[PDB]
DNA sequence: CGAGGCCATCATGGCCTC
DNA sequence: CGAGGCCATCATGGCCTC
């Protein structure tokens, strides 16, 4: 039922590092449409986001975003966990920023909302 | 009997990469005193070496050297294998150049020969 | 082909601080 | 302590060529 990773199509644009203290500035979260609508507003505010888009991903929503400062993926996961409870919530750092966004606007993906195009 | 790696004291200065196409310019070979005396002259010539020292390492000899151009560790191993046969021959790339040399001049290590100090 | 170069990418982990 | 930043190091592997 609930996804356990991102969609194969996306997996190459993503960091899967487990033992890294690396900070980055582009992230994506996979969760339910309604949790993603909430996190859109909350994440935008928390991280003074430079950009943030919400996307349809299969039965669900992918939040994509970039931040003025860097964060550990863990830190953003710990932040989102404080806002609500989630059936699933998968939070991953984005290695290939432009290519993640492009594909999430493309298909089987749609834009729902975004602070620019 | 014959060593199967370099001495623990040295292991941190060394590359242990198995699946890398990386080229570098500083190497060390662990082998018998007599194979090392041979490779000293031969390695110097083959690689137009910028520097090369031979060292006493326990019952044995460590060849240390730097090259004007870069090489895969594998390439230098393949070269040394063409010169003779060896009871053991351990060829490794050197990550920390200065610190490898310093320690090999230090102790339980001595210089035997070197194209400078 | 496969030996032996090139490079960009990014995970590892040491370190530091509130 | 331990969350969450910083960075330098260097292994991975894609690519290319004789």
PDB file of C-alpha atoms (C1' of nucleotides) in Angstrom:
ATOM      1  CA  UNK A   1       0.000   0.000   0.000  1.00  0.00           C
ATOM      2  CA  UNK A   2       2.014   3.012   1.289  1.00  0.00           C
ATOM      3  CA  UNK A   3       5.219   3.555  -0.746  1.00  0.00           C
ATOM      4  CA  UNK A   4       8.560   2.593   0.848  1.00  0.00           C
ATOM      5  CA  UNK A   5      10.799   4.628  -1.371  1.00  0.00           C
ATOM      6  CA  UNK A   6      10.499   7.111  -4.193  1.00  0.00           C
ATOM      7  CA  UNK A   7       9.509   5.823  -7.713  1.00  0.00           C
ATOM      8  CA  UNK A   8      12.304   4.092  -9.636  1.00  0.00           C
ATOM      9  CA  UNK A   9      12.127   6.903 -12.289  1.00  0.00           C
ATOM     10  CA  UNK A  10      13.420   9.344  -9.623  1.00  0.00           C
ATOM     11  CA  UNK A  11      15.897   7.192  -7.656  1.00  0.00           C
ATOM     12  CA  UNK A  12      18.967   8.305  -9.602  1.00  0.00           C
ATOM     13  CA  UNK A  13      18.457  12.007  -8.863  1.00  0.00           C
ATOM     14  CA  UNK A  14      18.358  11.302  -5.130  1.00  0.00           C
ATOM     15  CA  UNK A  15      20.868  10.886  -2.307  1.00  0.00           C
ATOM     16  CA  UNK A  16      20.531   7.518  -0.582  1.00  0.00           C
ATOM     17  CA  UNK A  17      23.423   8.235   1.903  1.00  0.00           C
ATOM     18  CA  UNK A  18      22.832   6.759   5.363  1.00  0.00           C
ATOM     19  CA  UNK A  19      26.244   7.584   7.134  1.00  0.00           C
ATOM     20  CA  UNK A  20      26.831  11.070   5.885  1.00  0.00           C
ATOM     21  CA  UNK A  21      26.977  14.328   7.789  1.00  0.00           C
ATOM     22  CA  UNK A  22      26.493  16.019   4.417  1.00  0.00           C
ATOM     23  CA  UNK A  23      24.264  19.066   4.190  1.00  0.00           C
ATOM     24  CA  UNK A  24      22.515  20.050   1.052  1.00  0.00           C
ATOM     25  CA  UNK A  25      20.016  22.495  -0.188  1.00  0.00           C
ATOM     26  CA  UNK A  26      17.617  20.511  -2.282  1.00  0.00           C
ATOM     27  CA  UNK A  27      15.159  17.952  -0.897  1.00  0.00           C
ATOM     28  CA  UNK A  28      12.095  15.957  -1.736  1.00  0.00           C
ATOM     29  CA  UNK A  29       9.523  14.325   0.581  1.00  0.00           C
ATOM     30  CA  UNK A  30       7.100  11.587  -0.542  1.00  0.00           C
ATOM     31  CA  UNK A  31       3.835  11.414   1.419  1.00  0.00           C
ATOM     32  CA  UNK A  32       0.016  11.607   1.153  1.00  0.00           C
ATOM     33  CA  UNK A  33      -1.611  14.564  -0.689  1.00  0.00           C
ATOM     34  CA  UNK A  34      -2.972  16.015   2.478  1.00  0.00           C
ATOM     35  CA  UNK A  35       0.258  15.775   4.478  1.00  0.00           C
ATOM     36  CA  UNK A  36       2.073  17.335   1.516  1.00  0.00           C
ATOM     37  CA  UNK A  37      -0.403  20.285   1.328  1.00  0.00           C
ATOM     38  CA  UNK A  38       0.334  20.957   5.012  1.00  0.00           C
ATOM     39  CA  UNK A  39       4.110  20.622   4.670  1.00  0.00           C
ATOM     40  CA  UNK A  40       4.125  22.902   1.639  1.00  0.00           C
ATOM     41  CA  UNK A  41       3.183  25.888   3.769  1.00  0.00           C
ATOM     42  CA  UNK A  42       5.118  24.805   6.832  1.00  0.00           C
ATOM     43  CA  UNK A  43       8.331  23.874   4.975  1.00  0.00           C
ATOM     44  CA  UNK A  44       8.309  27.159   2.974  1.00  0.00           C
ATOM     45  CA  UNK A  45       8.232  29.049   6.261  1.00  0.00           C
ATOM     46  CA  UNK A  46      10.622  26.963   8.362  1.00  0.00           C
ATOM     47  CA  UNK A  47      13.463  27.023   5.785  1.00  0.00           C
ATOM     48  CA  UNK A  48      12.904  30.481   4.187  1.00  0.00           C
ATOM     49  CA  UNK A  49      12.670  28.411   1.056  1.00  0.00           C
ATOM     50  CA  UNK A  50      13.996  29.860  -2.251  1.00  0.00           C
ATOM     51  CA  UNK A  51      11.560  27.645  -4.205  1.00  0.00           C
ATOM     52  CA  UNK A  52       9.089  24.787  -3.377  1.00  0.00           C
ATOM     53  CA  UNK A  53       6.753  22.793  -5.554  1.00  0.00           C
ATOM     54  CA  UNK A  54       4.141  20.222  -4.727  1.00  0.00           C
ATOM     55  CA  UNK A  55       3.594  17.441  -7.279  1.00  0.00           C
ATOM     56  CA  UNK A  56       1.244  14.538  -8.014  1.00  0.00           C
ATOM     57  CA  UNK A  57       3.128  11.275  -7.805  1.00  0.00           C
ATOM     58  CA  UNK A  58       0.929   8.307  -8.499  1.00  0.00           C
ATOM     59  CA  UNK A  59      -1.703   8.253  -5.750  1.00  0.00           C
ATOM     60  CA  UNK A  60       0.332  10.737  -3.784  1.00  0.00           C
ATOM     61  CA  UNK A  61       2.331  13.980  -3.585  1.00  0.00           C
ATOM     62  CA  UNK A  62       5.979  14.858  -3.827  1.00  0.00           C
ATOM     63  CA  UNK A  63       7.209  18.011  -2.182  1.00  0.00           C
ATOM     64  CA  UNK A  64      10.359  19.359  -3.928  1.00  0.00           C
ATOM     65  CA  UNK A  65      12.274  22.406  -2.523  1.00  0.00           C
ATOM     66  CA  UNK A  66      15.521  24.398  -2.288  1.00  0.00           C
ATOM     67  CA  UNK A  67      16.852  26.295   0.654  1.00  0.00           C
ATOM     68  CA  UNK A  68      19.010  29.406   1.071  1.00  0.00           C
ATOM     69  CA  UNK A  69      21.122  27.512   3.659  1.00  0.00           C
ATOM     70  CA  UNK A  70      22.164  23.903   3.813  1.00  0.00           C
ATOM     71  CA  UNK A  71      20.582  21.199   5.863  1.00  0.00           C
ATOM     72  CA  UNK A  72      21.139  17.650   6.741  1.00  0.00           C
ATOM     73  CA  UNK A  73      18.338  15.462   5.279  1.00  0.00           C
ATOM     74  CA  UNK A  74      17.859  14.137   8.817  1.00  0.00           C
ATOM     75  CA  UNK A  75      17.128  17.697  10.069  1.00  0.00           C
ATOM     76  CA  UNK A  76      14.340  18.204   7.553  1.00  0.00           C
ATOM     77  CA  UNK A  77      12.938  14.753   8.314  1.00  0.00           C
ATOM     78  CA  UNK A  78      13.041  15.661  12.054  1.00  0.00           C
ATOM     79  CA  UNK A  79      11.253  18.874  11.289  1.00  0.00           C
ATOM     80  CA  UNK A  80       8.455  17.312   9.260  1.00  0.00           C
ATOM     81  CA  UNK A  81       7.940  14.622  11.954  1.00  0.00           C
ATOM     82  CA  UNK A  82       7.129  17.435  14.465  1.00  0.00           C
ATOM     83  CA  UNK A  83       4.228  18.822  12.443  1.00  0.00           C
ATOM     84  CA  UNK A  84       1.826  15.884  12.351  1.00  0.00           C
ATOM     85  CA  UNK A  85       1.685  12.119  12.056  1.00  0.00           C
ATOM     86  CA  UNK A  86       2.126  10.431   8.641  1.00  0.00           C
ATOM     87  CA  UNK A  87       1.122   7.000   7.239  1.00  0.00           C
ATOM     88  CA  UNK A  88       4.339   7.173   5.267  1.00  0.00           C
ATOM     89  CA  UNK A  89       6.868   9.994   4.914  1.00  0.00           C
ATOM     90  CA  UNK A  90      10.015   9.526   2.894  1.00  0.00           C
ATOM     91  CA  UNK A  91      12.472  12.351   3.014  1.00  0.00           C
ATOM     92  CA  UNK A  92      15.475  12.400   0.658  1.00  0.00           C
ATOM     93  CA  UNK A  93      18.208  14.790  -0.406  1.00  0.00           C
ATOM     94  CA  UNK A  94      18.378  15.688  -4.119  1.00  0.00           C
ATOM     95  CA  UNK A  95      21.720  15.340  -5.937  1.00  0.00           C
ATOM     96  CA  UNK A  96      20.405  16.371  -9.400  1.00  0.00           C
ATOM     97  CA  UNK A  97      18.165  19.370  -8.657  1.00  0.00           C
ATOM     98  CA  UNK A  98      17.106  20.619 -12.125  1.00  0.00           C
ATOM     99  CA  UNK A  99      16.571  17.032 -13.347  1.00  0.00           C
ATOM    100  CA  UNK A 100      14.369  16.116 -10.367  1.00  0.00           C
ATOM    101  CA  UNK A 101      12.139  19.175 -10.864  1.00  0.00           C
ATOM    102  CA  UNK A 102      11.947  18.695 -14.644  1.00  0.00           C
ATOM    103  CA  UNK A 103      10.782  15.119 -14.242  1.00  0.00           C
ATOM    104  CA  UNK A 104       8.239  15.936 -11.532  1.00  0.00           C
ATOM    105  CA  UNK A 105       6.662  18.543 -13.807  1.00  0.00           C
ATOM    106  CA  UNK A 106       6.813  15.954 -16.655  1.00  0.00           C
ATOM    107  CA  UNK A 107       4.962  12.570 -16.335  1.00  0.00           C
ATOM    108  CA  UNK A 108       3.485  10.404 -14.634  1.00  0.00           C
ATOM    109  CA  UNK A 109       3.807  13.661 -12.649  1.00  0.00           C
ATOM    110  CA  UNK A 110       2.014  16.970 -12.528  1.00  0.00           C
ATOM    111  CA  UNK A 111       2.558  20.311 -10.788  1.00  0.00           C
ATOM    112  CA  UNK A 112      -0.137  21.200  -8.222  1.00  0.00           C
ATOM    113  CA  UNK A 113       1.437  24.338  -6.720  1.00  0.00           C
ATOM    114  CA  UNK A 114       4.809  26.099  -6.834  1.00  0.00           C
ATOM    115  CA  UNK A 115       6.202  29.481  -5.724  1.00  0.00           C
ATOM    116  CA  UNK A 116       7.260  30.150  -9.440  1.00  0.00           C
ATOM    117  CA  UNK A 117       7.279  28.007 -12.598  1.00  0.00           C
TER     118      UNK A 117
ATOM    119  CA  UNK B   1      55.791 -15.788   6.729  1.00  0.00           C
ATOM    120  CA  UNK B   2      55.506 -13.430   3.704  1.00  0.00           C
ATOM    121  CA  UNK B   3      53.491 -10.277   4.544  1.00  0.00           C
ATOM    122  CA  UNK B   4      49.936  -9.979   3.165  1.00  0.00           C
ATOM    123  CA  UNK B   5      49.549  -6.265   3.525  1.00  0.00           C
ATOM    124  CA  UNK B   6      51.607  -3.287   4.581  1.00  0.00           C
ATOM    125  CA  UNK B   7      52.347  -2.775   8.353  1.00  0.00           C
ATOM    126  CA  UNK B   8      49.440  -1.391  10.388  1.00  0.00           C
ATOM    127  CA  UNK B   9      51.542   1.777  11.108  1.00  0.00           C
ATOM    128  CA  UNK B  10      51.313   2.639   7.374  1.00  0.00           C
ATOM    129  CA  UNK B  11      47.775   1.496   6.473  1.00  0.00           C
ATOM    130  CA  UNK B  12      46.160   4.904   6.957  1.00  0.00           C
ATOM    131  CA  UNK B  13      48.428   6.662   4.452  1.00  0.00           C
ATOM    132  CA  UNK B  14      47.491   4.149   1.760  1.00  0.00           C
ATOM    133  CA  UNK B  15      44.704   3.703  -0.785  1.00  0.00           C
ATOM    134  CA  UNK B  16      42.891   0.394  -0.351  1.00  0.00           C
ATOM    135  CA  UNK B  17      40.449   1.074  -3.288  1.00  0.00           C
ATOM    136  CA  UNK B  18      39.556  -2.059  -5.257  1.00  0.00           C
ATOM    137  CA  UNK B  19      36.864  -0.648  -7.752  1.00  0.00           C
ATOM    138  CA  UNK B  20      38.450   2.619  -8.685  1.00  0.00           C
ATOM    139  CA  UNK B  21      39.738   3.812 -12.029  1.00  0.00           C
ATOM    140  CA  UNK B  22      41.622   6.467 -10.062  1.00  0.00           C
ATOM    141  CA  UNK B  23      45.130   7.398 -11.120  1.00  0.00           C
ATOM    142  CA  UNK B  24      47.645   8.790  -8.751  1.00  0.00           C
ATOM    143  CA  UNK B  25      51.231   9.724  -8.603  1.00  0.00           C
ATOM    144  CA  UNK B  26      52.523   8.265  -5.396  1.00  0.00           C
ATOM    145  CA  UNK B  27      52.956   4.537  -4.748  1.00  0.00           C
ATOM    146  CA  UNK B  28      54.576   2.046  -2.459  1.00  0.00           C
ATOM    147  CA  UNK B  29      55.437  -1.635  -3.059  1.00  0.00           C
ATOM    148  CA  UNK B  30      56.179  -4.119  -0.248  1.00  0.00           C
ATOM    149  CA  UNK B  31      58.453  -7.022  -1.213  1.00  0.00           C
ATOM    150  CA  UNK B  32      61.766  -8.789  -0.439  1.00  0.00           C
ATOM    151  CA  UNK B  33      65.007  -6.732  -0.218  1.00  0.00           C
ATOM    152  CA  UNK B  34      66.362  -8.202  -3.379  1.00  0.00           C
ATOM    153  CA  UNK B  35      63.214  -7.708  -5.461  1.00  0.00           C
ATOM    154  CA  UNK B  36      63.052  -4.134  -4.159  1.00  0.00           C
ATOM    155  CA  UNK B  37      66.708  -3.419  -5.156  1.00  0.00           C
ATOM    156  CA  UNK B  38      65.821  -4.557  -8.689  1.00  0.00           C
ATOM    157  CA  UNK B  39      62.573  -2.581  -8.877  1.00  0.00           C
ATOM    158  CA  UNK B  40      64.298   0.544  -7.593  1.00  0.00           C
ATOM    159  CA  UNK B  41      66.303   0.858 -10.791  1.00  0.00           C
ATOM    160  CA  UNK B  42      63.595  -0.459 -13.078  1.00  0.00           C
ATOM    161  CA  UNK B  43      60.757   1.637 -11.598  1.00  0.00           C
ATOM    162  CA  UNK B  44      62.870   4.849 -11.697  1.00  0.00           C
ATOM    163  CA  UNK B  45      63.375   4.287 -15.413  1.00  0.00           C
ATOM    164  CA  UNK B  46      59.922   3.070 -16.447  1.00  0.00           C
ATOM    165  CA  UNK B  47      58.045   6.002 -14.837  1.00  0.00           C
ATOM    166  CA  UNK B  48      60.626   8.826 -15.269  1.00  0.00           C
ATOM    167  CA  UNK B  49      60.256   9.021 -11.533  1.00  0.00           C
ATOM    168  CA  UNK B  50      60.500  12.447  -9.801  1.00  0.00           C
ATOM    169  CA  UNK B  51      61.673  10.742  -6.581  1.00  0.00           C
ATOM    170  CA  UNK B  52      62.055   7.109  -5.310  1.00  0.00           C
ATOM    171  CA  UNK B  53      63.303   5.722  -2.040  1.00  0.00           C
ATOM    172  CA  UNK B  54      63.953   2.203  -0.898  1.00  0.00           C
ATOM    173  CA  UNK B  55      63.364   1.454   2.795  1.00  0.00           C
ATOM    174  CA  UNK B  56      63.890  -1.307   5.362  1.00  0.00           C
ATOM    175  CA  UNK B  57      60.554  -2.554   6.610  1.00  0.00           C
ATOM    176  CA  UNK B  58      60.913  -5.300   9.152  1.00  0.00           C
ATOM    177  CA  UNK B  59      62.592  -8.210   7.361  1.00  0.00           C
ATOM    178  CA  UNK B  60      61.891  -6.549   4.055  1.00  0.00           C
ATOM    179  CA  UNK B  61      61.929  -3.464   1.810  1.00  0.00           C
ATOM    180  CA  UNK B  62      59.416  -0.815   0.912  1.00  0.00           C
ATOM    181  CA  UNK B  63      59.795   1.026  -2.348  1.00  0.00           C
ATOM    182  CA  UNK B  64      58.205   4.523  -2.168  1.00  0.00           C
ATOM    183  CA  UNK B  65      58.000   6.789  -5.291  1.00  0.00           C
ATOM    184  CA  UNK B  66      56.332   9.700  -7.110  1.00  0.00           C
ATOM    185  CA  UNK B  67      55.733  10.077 -10.788  1.00  0.00           C
ATOM    186  CA  UNK B  68      55.532  13.043 -13.170  1.00  0.00           C
ATOM    187  CA  UNK B  69      52.327  11.543 -14.660  1.00  0.00           C
ATOM    188  CA  UNK B  70      49.513   9.651 -13.036  1.00  0.00           C
ATOM    189  CA  UNK B  71      49.029   5.938 -13.011  1.00  0.00           C
ATOM    190  CA  UNK B  72      46.525   3.439 -11.934  1.00  0.00           C
ATOM    191  CA  UNK B  73      47.932   1.294  -9.071  1.00  0.00           C
ATOM    192  CA  UNK B  74      47.012  -1.723 -11.205  1.00  0.00           C
ATOM    193  CA  UNK B  75      49.299  -0.449 -14.020  1.00  0.00           C
ATOM    194  CA  UNK B  76      52.313  -0.256 -11.730  1.00  0.00           C
ATOM    195  CA  UNK B  77      51.504  -3.672 -10.271  1.00  0.00           C
ATOM    196  CA  UNK B  78      51.258  -5.024 -13.868  1.00  0.00           C
ATOM    197  CA  UNK B  79      54.583  -3.462 -14.647  1.00  0.00           C
ATOM    198  CA  UNK B  80      56.419  -4.892 -11.651  1.00  0.00           C
ATOM    199  CA  UNK B  81      54.947  -8.370 -12.351  1.00  0.00           C
ATOM    200  CA  UNK B  82      56.686  -8.303 -15.792  1.00  0.00           C
ATOM    201  CA  UNK B  83      60.176  -7.858 -14.362  1.00  0.00           C
ATOM    202  CA  UNK B  84      60.616 -11.015 -12.300  1.00  0.00           C
ATOM    203  CA  UNK B  85      58.777 -13.399 -10.017  1.00  0.00           C
ATOM    204  CA  UNK B  86      58.101 -12.443  -6.366  1.00  0.00           C
ATOM    205  CA  UNK B  87      57.346 -14.476  -3.197  1.00  0.00           C
ATOM    206  CA  UNK B  88      55.112 -11.593  -2.213  1.00  0.00           C
ATOM    207  CA  UNK B  89      54.582  -8.207  -3.867  1.00  0.00           C
ATOM    208  CA  UNK B  90      52.073  -5.756  -2.488  1.00  0.00           C
ATOM    209  CA  UNK B  91      51.523  -2.659  -4.523  1.00  0.00           C
ATOM    210  CA  UNK B  92      49.468   0.235  -3.118  1.00  0.00           C
ATOM    211  CA  UNK B  93      48.661   3.827  -3.988  1.00  0.00           C
ATOM    212  CA  UNK B  94      49.638   6.494  -1.427  1.00  0.00           C
ATOM    213  CA  UNK B  95      46.997   9.020  -0.313  1.00  0.00           C
ATOM    214  CA  UNK B  96      49.233  10.848   2.225  1.00  0.00           C
ATOM    215  CA  UNK B  97      52.559  11.221   0.392  1.00  0.00           C
ATOM    216  CA  UNK B  98      54.700  13.332   2.774  1.00  0.00           C
ATOM    217  CA  UNK B  99      53.442  11.350   5.797  1.00  0.00           C
ATOM    218  CA  UNK B 100      54.264   7.981   4.202  1.00  0.00           C
ATOM    219  CA  UNK B 101      57.827   9.063   3.359  1.00  0.00           C
ATOM    220  CA  UNK B 102      58.382  10.669   6.775  1.00  0.00           C
ATOM    221  CA  UNK B 103      57.372   7.490   8.558  1.00  0.00           C
ATOM    222  CA  UNK B 104      59.447   5.219   6.318  1.00  0.00           C
ATOM    223  CA  UNK B 105      62.535   7.305   7.076  1.00  0.00           C
ATOM    224  CA  UNK B 106      61.520   7.213  10.790  1.00  0.00           C
ATOM    225  CA  UNK B 107      61.195   3.837  12.656  1.00  0.00           C
ATOM    226  CA  UNK B 108      60.971   0.720  12.662  1.00  0.00           C
ATOM    227  CA  UNK B 109      62.098   1.964   9.222  1.00  0.00           C
ATOM    228  CA  UNK B 110      65.326   3.112   7.661  1.00  0.00           C
ATOM    229  CA  UNK B 111      66.356   4.661   4.340  1.00  0.00           C
ATOM    230  CA  UNK B 112      68.621   2.434   2.206  1.00  0.00           C
ATOM    231  CA  UNK B 113      68.730   4.525  -0.987  1.00  0.00           C
ATOM    232  CA  UNK B 114      66.896   7.537  -2.416  1.00  0.00           C
ATOM    233  CA  UNK B 115      67.352   9.903  -5.383  1.00  0.00           C
ATOM    234  CA  UNK B 116      67.473  12.894  -2.851  1.00  0.00           C
ATOM    235  CA  UNK B 117      66.860  13.189   0.904  1.00  0.00           C
TER     236      UNK B 117
ATOM    237  C1'  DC C   1      38.333  -6.203 -26.181  1.00  0.00           C
ATOM    238  C1'  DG C   2      40.698  -4.648 -22.170  1.00  0.00           C
ATOM    239  C1'  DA C   3      44.700  -1.899 -20.276  1.00  0.00           C
ATOM    240  C1'  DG C   4      45.199   2.357 -18.495  1.00  0.00           C
ATOM    241  C1'  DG C   5      44.213   7.164 -18.729  1.00  0.00           C
ATOM    242  C1'  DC C   6      40.450  11.185 -17.628  1.00  0.00           C
ATOM    243  C1'  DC C   7      37.051  13.470 -14.859  1.00  0.00           C
ATOM    244  C1'  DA C   8      32.712  14.941 -12.001  1.00  0.00           C
ATOM    245  C1'  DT C   9      29.970  13.268  -8.387  1.00  0.00           C
ATOM    246  C1'  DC C  10      28.994  12.763  -3.843  1.00  0.00           C
ATOM    247  C1'  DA C  11      29.350   9.540   0.517  1.00  0.00           C
ATOM    248  C1'  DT C  12      32.352   9.210   4.523  1.00  0.00           C
ATOM    249  C1'  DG C  13      33.503  10.880   8.502  1.00  0.00           C
ATOM    250  C1'  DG C  14      36.367  14.190  11.413  1.00  0.00           C
ATOM    251  C1'  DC C  15      35.506  18.215  13.528  1.00  0.00           C
ATOM    252  C1'  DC C  16      32.968  21.804  15.881  1.00  0.00           C
ATOM    253  C1'  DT C  17      29.190  24.160  18.586  1.00  0.00           C
ATOM    254  C1'  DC C  18      24.871  25.256  21.126  1.00  0.00           C
TER     255       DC C  18
ATOM    256  C1'  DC D   1      25.242  14.589  25.095  1.00  0.00           C
ATOM    257  C1'  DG D   2      23.420  14.722  20.538  1.00  0.00           C
ATOM    258  C1'  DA D   3      21.244  17.643  16.811  1.00  0.00           C
ATOM    259  C1'  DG D   4      22.792  19.745  12.974  1.00  0.00           C
ATOM    260  C1'  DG D   5      26.211  22.495  10.766  1.00  0.00           C
ATOM    261  C1'  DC D   6      31.281  22.536   8.351  1.00  0.00           C
ATOM    262  C1'  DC D   7      34.838  20.740   5.424  1.00  0.00           C
ATOM    263  C1'  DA D   8      38.724  17.862   3.021  1.00  0.00           C
ATOM    264  C1'  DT D   9      39.481  13.370   1.399  1.00  0.00           C
ATOM    265  C1'  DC D  10      39.237  10.087  -1.920  1.00  0.00           C
ATOM    266  C1'  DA D  11      36.473   5.831  -3.862  1.00  0.00           C
ATOM    267  C1'  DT D  12      33.120   5.071  -7.515  1.00  0.00           C
ATOM    268  C1'  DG D  13      32.371   4.649 -11.898  1.00  0.00           C
ATOM    269  C1'  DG D  14      31.261   6.787 -16.570  1.00  0.00           C
ATOM    270  C1'  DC D  15      33.756   7.834 -20.324  1.00  0.00           C
ATOM    271  C1'  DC D  16      37.365   7.575 -23.754  1.00  0.00           C
ATOM    272  C1'  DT D  17      41.285   5.657 -26.601  1.00  0.00           C
ATOM    273  C1'  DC D  18      45.009   2.714 -28.544  1.00  0.00           C
TER     274       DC D  18
END
